[PDB]
Design a protein around this ligand. Structure first.
Ligand SMILES: Cc1ncsc1C(=O)N1CCNC(=O)C1
Ligand SMILES: Cc1ncsc1C(=O)N1CCNC(=O)C1
Lengths: 269, 268
């Protein structure tokens, strides 16, 4: 991988692995999400961020602050097959005091065509108190160093799916998968549950017949609260709709505390 | 990746990923096991095996046969850190009518030193009846085309750890993790639970304090029966001792054994 000529974005190629594919012999959405996270991490290292798994700036370390995901939105047109080379371009942008955004474009390395796109919103959090906060002036000035100054969006459109409000699923759910627990392979190097695991848990309550007959086209996931290593999760899904749409909810199995909410759009194979 | 000059082994380089590492910022044993499986699949594709996830020969397809894992043994001296390049060399060998073996050597790409080694035993199974079989004359002939004819072993030593008999853990277990279930990311392209998932489930019953203070040096795992997509597993562990453990994976309900194994850990 490497930064582009202007030093304002980063590109990396990946060869899709045997264990990274599903029944259709193409990359799962979890493999796509792991690759987005990997290229994001390589971009951060290349522009001088912390090499400790937290990707913080100098001002962030002085104030004991970290970036936490608020939303992930992924749209896939073609999933790369086992053995194909996918090229992913990524860049960051500051959104005033709200937070920051990381965007991605996925391409077929051979044809050069765009096969997918993604966007993620990140918010500032104090590492100690776990309280969300606004982005300060000094942090906004550090982002100018490596971010394009004219707006560059993976999802530019006037009314795009990436910015839609997601409602809270009402009981009873149409489908459910209960008692989901993370194992050590679900944790990152800092022992927090990997953001990609929440995607897999959301999808666990989609009926197998939908997965067997449809391709996942869009997924939008809101991150409300973290699942801990010793927490147990319930994944709930209700149909909201040639195209199938679902509303999703992840909550703690005990008290029912919400951890994530989201939506998926599937098209017939 | 590519076959070596003699066409009897295969080499591939991997850059260790951010999500592939543990708290020590080095590759987990599950990442090592996934990389062994990946280079194994690339080797099979390059020597003309089926490209459907089963890696069968032409006589295996006519007889409706597939290879199933009987044992996996991995010994790691140094786990590669996040961003390091690891080089893995793999080859196969026929063991008469018993089955076949796939062996691996892991090296630090920069220094050229051996940082680990692995060996796996595979047995023939009829895909329809699920009955184990011996390897027939015709499939032993096909293995001669891409396997070294003089013995090449990752664990050559007589009476080594990779060939030891593993006992069955007796209740009560000292430690346990119950109610483990596979999700879709645990399945392979043919919807069977990935062999690497069983390694993770074995390790789930090791106390966190052992993981925090020790490095895993050796793991030997026997595969007895497959966990299905709708099965629930209990992982049991008892200390037998350097720290050594005896492990058992069994179905949550009736207690049917699926795997048994051992691990050896060294103080950090
Ligand atoms: C530079 C940056 N700005 C907003 S997100 C982000 C980033 O690259 N990451 C990936 C690693 N860990 C994180 O928490 C965030
Ligand atoms: C060629 C060969 N011979 C014994 S094991 C093996 C092998 O490469 N694999 C990896 C893919 N799927 C399998 O079932 C076994």
């Amino acid at each position: 991988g490497s930064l582009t000529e202007d030093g304002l974005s980063y590109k990396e190629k990946f060869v899709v692995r045997s264990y990274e594919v599903g029944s259709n012999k193409t990359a799962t959405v979890e493999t796509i999400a792991n690759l987005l996270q990997e290229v994001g991490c390589n971009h951060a290292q290349s522009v001088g961020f912390s090499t400790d798994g937290f990707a913080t700036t100098t001002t962030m370390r002085k104030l004991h602050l970290i970036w936490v995901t608020a939303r992930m939105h992924i749209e896939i047109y073609k999933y790369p097959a086992w053995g194909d080379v996918v090229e992913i371009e990524t860049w960051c942008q500051s959104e005033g005091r709200i937070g920051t955004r990381r965007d991605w474009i996925l391409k077929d390395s051979v044809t050069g065509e765009v096969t997918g796109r993604a966007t993620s919103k990140w918010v500032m959090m104090n590492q100690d108190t776990r309280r969300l906060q606004k982005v300060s002036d000094d942090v906004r000035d550090e982002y100018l160093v490596f971010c394009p100054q004219e707006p560059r969006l993976a999802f530019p459109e006037e009314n795009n799916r990436s910015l839609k409000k997601i409602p809270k699923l009402e009981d009873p759910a149409q489908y459910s998968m209960i008692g989901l627990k993370p194992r050590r392979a679900d944790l990152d190097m800092n022992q927090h549950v990997n953001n990609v695991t929440y995607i897999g848990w959301v999808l666990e309550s989609i009926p197998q017949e939908i997965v067997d007959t449809h391709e996942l086209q869009v997924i939008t996931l809101d991150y409300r609260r973290e699942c801990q290593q010793d927490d147990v999760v319930d994944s709930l899904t209700t149909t909201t709709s040639n195209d199938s749409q679902f509303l999703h909810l992840l909550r703690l199995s005990g008290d029912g505390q919400e951890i994530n909410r989201g939506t998926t759009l599937w098209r017939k194979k």
